[PDB]
Amino acid sequence: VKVPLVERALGRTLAADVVTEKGVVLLEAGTLLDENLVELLDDNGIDMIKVRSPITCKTRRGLCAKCYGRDLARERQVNVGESVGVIAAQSIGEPGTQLTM
Amino acid sequence: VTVEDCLDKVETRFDLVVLASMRANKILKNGYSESMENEKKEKATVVALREIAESEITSEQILRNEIEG
Amino acid sequence: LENLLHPTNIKIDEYAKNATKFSFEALERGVGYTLGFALKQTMLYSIAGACVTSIKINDGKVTSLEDVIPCDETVADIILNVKSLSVTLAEDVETGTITFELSGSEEEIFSEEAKLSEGLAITEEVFICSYNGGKKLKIEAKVEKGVGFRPAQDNFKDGEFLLDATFSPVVFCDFEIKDARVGRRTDLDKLELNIKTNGNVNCEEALRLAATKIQNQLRNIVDIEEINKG
Amino acid sequence: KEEDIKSLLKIGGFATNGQMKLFDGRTGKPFDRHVTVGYMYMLKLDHLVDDKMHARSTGSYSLVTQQPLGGKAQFGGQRFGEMEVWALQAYGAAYTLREMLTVK
Amino acid sequence: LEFVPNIQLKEDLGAFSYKVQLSPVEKGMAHILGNSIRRVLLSSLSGASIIKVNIANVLHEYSTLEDVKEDVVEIVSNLKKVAIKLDTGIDRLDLELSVNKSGVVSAGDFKTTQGVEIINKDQPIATLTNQRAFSLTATVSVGRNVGILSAIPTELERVGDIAVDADFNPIKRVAFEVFDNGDSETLEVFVKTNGTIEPLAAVTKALEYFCEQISVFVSLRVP
Amino acid sequence: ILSPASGQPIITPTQDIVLGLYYITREKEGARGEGKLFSSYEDVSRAY
Ligand SMILES: Nc1nc2c(ncn2[C@@H]2O[C@H](COP(=O)(O)OP(=O)(O)O)[C@@H](OP(=O)(O)OP(=O)(O)O)[C@H]2O)c(=O)[nH]1
Numbered sequence: 001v002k003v004p005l006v007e008r009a010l011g012r013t014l015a016a017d018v019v020t021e022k023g024v025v026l027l028e029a030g031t032l033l034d035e036n037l038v039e040l041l042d043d044n045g046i047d048m049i050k051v052r053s054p055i056t057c058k059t060r061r062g063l064c065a066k067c068y069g070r071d072l073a074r075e076r077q078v079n080v081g082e083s084v085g086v087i088a089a090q091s092i093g094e095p096g097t098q099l100t101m
Numbered sequence: 102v103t104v105e106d107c108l109d110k111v112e113t114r115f116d117l118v119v120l121a122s123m124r125a126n127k128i129l130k131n132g133y134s135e136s137m138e139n140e141k142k143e144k145a146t147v148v149a150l151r152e153i154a155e156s157e158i159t160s161e162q163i164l165r166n167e168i169e170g
Numbered sequence: 171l172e173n174l175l176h177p178t179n180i181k182i183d184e185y186a187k188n189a190t191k192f193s194f195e196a197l198e199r200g201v202g203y204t205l206g207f208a209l210k211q212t213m214l215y216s217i218a219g220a221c222v223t224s225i226k227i228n229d230g231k232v233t234s235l236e237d238v239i240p241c242d243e244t245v246a247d248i249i250l251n252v253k254s255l256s257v258t259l260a261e262d263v264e265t266g267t268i269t270f271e272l273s274g275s276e277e278e279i280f281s282e283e284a285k286l287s288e289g290l291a292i293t294e295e296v297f298i299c300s301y302n303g304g305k306k307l308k309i310e311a312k313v314e315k316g317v318g319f320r321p322a323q324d325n326f327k328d329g330e331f332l333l334d335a336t337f338s339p340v341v342f343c344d345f346e347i348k349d350a351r352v353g354r355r356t357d358l359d360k361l362e363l364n365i366k367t368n369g370n371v372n373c374e375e376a377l378r379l380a381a382t383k384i385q386n387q388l389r390n391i392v393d394i395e396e397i398n399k400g
Numbered sequence: 401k402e403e404d405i406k407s408l409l410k411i412g413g414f415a416t417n418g419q420m421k422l423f424d425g426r427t428g429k430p431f432d433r434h435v436t437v438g439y440m441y442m443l444k445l446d447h448l449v450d451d452k453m454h455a456r457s458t459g460s461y462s463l464v465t466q467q468p469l470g471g472k473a474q475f476g477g478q479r480f481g482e483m484e485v486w487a488l489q490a491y492g493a494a495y496t497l498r499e500m501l502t503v504k
Numbered sequence: 505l506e507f508v509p510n511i512q513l514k515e516d517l518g519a520f521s522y523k524v525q526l527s528p529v530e531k532g533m534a535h536i537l538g539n540s541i542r543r544v545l546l547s548s549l550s551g552a553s554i555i556k557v558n559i560a561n562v563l564h565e566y567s568t569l570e571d572v573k574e575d576v577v578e579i580v581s582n583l584k585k586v587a588i589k590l591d592t593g594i595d596r597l598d599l600e601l602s603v604n605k606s607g608v609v610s611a612g613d614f615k616t617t618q619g620v621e622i623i624n625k626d627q628p629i630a631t632l633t634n635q636r637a638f639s640l641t642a643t644v645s646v647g648r649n650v651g652i653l654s655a656i657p658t659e660l661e662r663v664g665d666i667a668v669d670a671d672f673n674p675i676k677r678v679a680f681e682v683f684d685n686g687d688s689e690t691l692e693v694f695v696k697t698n699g700t701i702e703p704l705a706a707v708t709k710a711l712e713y714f715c716e717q718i719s720v721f722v723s724l725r726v727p
Numbered sequence: 728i729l730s731p732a733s734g735q736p737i738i739t740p741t742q743d744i745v746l747g748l749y750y751i752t753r754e755k756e757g758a759r760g761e762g763k764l765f766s767s768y769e770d771v772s773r774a775y
C-alpha cells in the first residue's frame with residue numbers, strides 16, 4: 001500500500017458525502033476529516049473518497065479556508081490571513097538538499 | 102507567554118495580537134508610567150495579554166475604547 | 171581571610187500536609203551540592219525509626235499474593251496498606267505486635283480496629299480493607315525499631331512476607347541547586363529542599379535533628395559551642 | 401598493533417583495557433561501567449570569540465545608499481537576508497517586517 | 505550506643521604524602537564526612553603566593569636581560585611555581601633578592617627575612633651565563649582561589665611592576681576510603697600537599713569550615 | 728512545536744537524552760531486589 005488512504009485523507013475535508021455498499025450514507029459533504037472520523041473509513045473499508053483541493057478552489061486570486069482544510073501545524077482549520085503559498089514553497093525546497101538521487 | 106490561555110477568548114491568533122497592541126498603546130498613553138510601578142511590575146504589553154486572559158477587559162469593549170480616544 | 175559569606179536568607183513554604191519546601195540563598199560556589207548531598211543522606215538513612223517488617227495473614231496459610239481472600243482487596247493491596255501504617259514505639263518495648271483478626275460481617279476496617287501490644291500507637295485512622303462478612307480471616311503485623319535502611323533477602327521465607335524497613339520518618343528530599351547573584355560575583359549557588367514526612371514529626375524539626383547529628387560527631391575534633399556564638 | 405599497546409599497558413600495571421573505574425566528584429560514588437581514559441593530545445584552532453562578538457547599536461551609513469556598513473570593519477552590523485524576509489512572510493508578522501525595512 | 509571520631513596522622517609516606525584516619529564513625533556517616541573533607545580542602549584552602557615581581561632593569565615582561573639564558577616571561581613562570589609558607593598574622597610582606605653569583609640563581613638565594621619561608625630551595629629562579637648583579641622584589645600576600653572570572657587584576661604603582669598570577673590552594677590531591685570494623689567504621693583519607701601546611705591542621709580547618717556552614721541549618725534562622 | 732511541513736513534533740530528544748532513557752528502561756532477568764513491591768514512586772526512589 002505504501003500510503004494508507006486514511007493517512008492521505010487525514011486533515012482533509014470531503015467534497016461530497018460517501019455512500020456505503022449497504023446504501024447507508026456514512027459521512028456528510030463539507031465535513032473535515034478527524035483521527036476519530038478516520039477510523040470509520042477503514043472500518044467501513046471505503047477505498048475511494050472525494051475531497052476539496054486548492055486547484056478546485058473557485059475563489060479569484062485567493063484560497064478559501066475550507067479547501068486547505070487542516071493547517072497541519074496547529075492541528076486546527078487554517079486561520080485567515082496565513083500565507084499558505086510561502087510555507088508550501090519553502091517546505092518542498094528544504095527537504096531537497098538531503099535527497100541526492 | 103504560551104498565548105494558549107489568551108486564545109480561548111480570542112480567535113485566529115491575529116485579532117488577539119491586534120487587540121493587545123491597541124490596549125498596550127492606550128495604557129501607555131494613559132500616563133500609567135509614573136516610574137514608581139514599572140520597576141515592581143511587568144511591562145504594559147504583557148499586562149494587556151494578562152487582562153485578555155482574565156477576560157475582564159472584553160474584546161468587544163476594547164473596540165469601544167478606540168472611539169473614546 | 172576575606173570572610174566566607176553566610177546565606178543570610180531563609181524562605182519556608184508548606185504546600186502539603188506533610189510536605190514542606192526550604193529555600194537557601196547566598197551560598198558559596200559549590201557549597202550547595204556538598205551541604206545538600208550530606209543532608210539528604212543523613213535524613214533518609216541517618217534517623218532512627220520503628221516500622222512494620224513482617225506481615226502474616228493466616229499463620230503462613232497464605233503462600234502467594236494470587237491466593238484469593240474474602241475481601242475487596244487482594245493480599246498484595248492489604249500488605250501495601252499495612253506497610254503505610256506508622257507506629258511509635260516506647261523506649262522500654264523493643265518490639266511491636268499488631269493483631270487484625272476480625273469476625274465482623276461486611277464491616278469497614280480501620281487503624282482503630284485491631285488490638286496492639288503496649289507501647290504501640292497507631293497515630294492515624296488510615297483505612298485498610300472492606301470486609302465481605304465471609305469465612306474467618308486473620309492479620310498479623312510485626313513491628314521493629316532500627317536506624318538506617320535494612321533490605322530483605324527473601325520477600326517470603328516461611329509463613330510471613332518479609333519487607334525491608336525504612337526506619338526513617340522522612341520519605342523525600344529531592345534537593346536542587348540554582349544560580350544566585352550576591353553582587354559583582356554571581357557564581358554563588360542557591361539551594362531549595364523539598365521534604366515529605368509520614369507526619370510522626372514535623373519536617374523542619376526533623377531536618378534540624380538531622381543537621382545536629384553531623385555537628386555532634388565533630389565535637390571531639392572541633393568546638394561546636396564557639397561556632398554557635400556569632 | 402593492538403597487542404603491543406596491551407603489553408605496554410600491562411608493563412604500566414593498568415588492566416588490558418582503556419576503560420577504568422571512576423568516581424563522581426560531587427557525590428564521590430563510582431559510575432556503573434568503566435570509562436576509557438586517554439591523553440587525547442589536543443590543539444587550539446585560531447578562532448577566538450573575542451573579535452566575533454561584533455556588538456553594534458548605531459553605526460555610520462553608506463554614502464550612496466545611506467545604509468549601515470557590514471563585516472565589523474568599522475561598526476559592522478548584521479545584514480537581513482531575503483530568505484529571512486520569506487520566513488517573516490510565512491510568520492505573518494507584517495509589523496516586524498515593515499519596521500525593520502524602513503526605520504532600522 | 506555513642507561513637508565520637510578521632511584524628512590520627514598515621515602512615516605518613518612520600519615527600520609530602522599523608523593518610524589521616526579516624527578510628528570512630530557513626531556506621532554510615534563516614535562516606536558523607538569523606539565527601540565533605542574532599543570538597544572543602546580543594547576549594548576552601550587559602551595559601552600565600554607572590555602576586556607582584558619587579559626586576560632591577562626591565563620595562564616589561566617581554567624583555568631580554570644581558571648574559572641571562574632565561575627570558576623575563578620564563579623567569580615569571582619559574583617564580584609562580586615557587587612555594588611560600590607565611591605566619592598567621594603576616595597577611596602581606598615584601599621579599600628582596602639581590603645576587604652577584606656567576607652561577608645559577610635559586611629560590612634559596614632569597615634573603616632569609618623573618619616569617620618568610622621558602623619550601624622550594626631546589627627550584628632555580630634563573631641561570632646566569634656570566635658574572636653580573638641581579639636584584640628583584642616580589643610581594644607576598646595570603647590569598648585563596650575564587651575562580652578565574654572573579655579575580656581582581658591588582659593595581660601596579662611602579663613602571664617596572666609586573667602582574668603575576670598565583671595559585672593559593674596548596675592541596676594537589678585528596679583521596680578518602682571507608683572500612684567497617686563491625687557496628688562501627690574507620691575513615692581513611694590520603695592528602696597530597698606542597699608541604700606548606702601540616703596535613704592534620706588542614707583536615708581540622710576543613711572540618712571546622714564544614715561545621716560553620718552546617719551551623720545555620722540547625723538554627724533555621726537568617727543569623 | 729510541530730513542523731509546518733509535517734505534524735510530527737520537532738522538539739523530540741535527538742542524541743544522548745534518548746540514550747539515557749533507553750538504558751534506564753531496559754530490564755534485567757536477574758537483579759537484586761527483584762520481585763519487590765513498592766506502593767508509590769517515592770518508595771521506589773528511596774529504595775534507589
Ligand atoms: N523549566 C520550564 N519552565 C516552564 C516551561 N513551560 C512553562 N514554564 C514556566 O511556567 C510559567 C508559565 O508562564 P506564562 O507564560 O505566564 O504561562 P503560560 O506558559 O501558560 O503562558 C513560566 O514562568 P516564568 O515567568 O517564565 O518564570 P518562573 O515563574 O518559571 O520562574 C515558565 O518559567 C518549560 O518547558 N520548562
Ligand SMILES: [Zn+2]
Pocket residue numbers: 056057058059062063064065067
Ligand atoms: Zn476555495
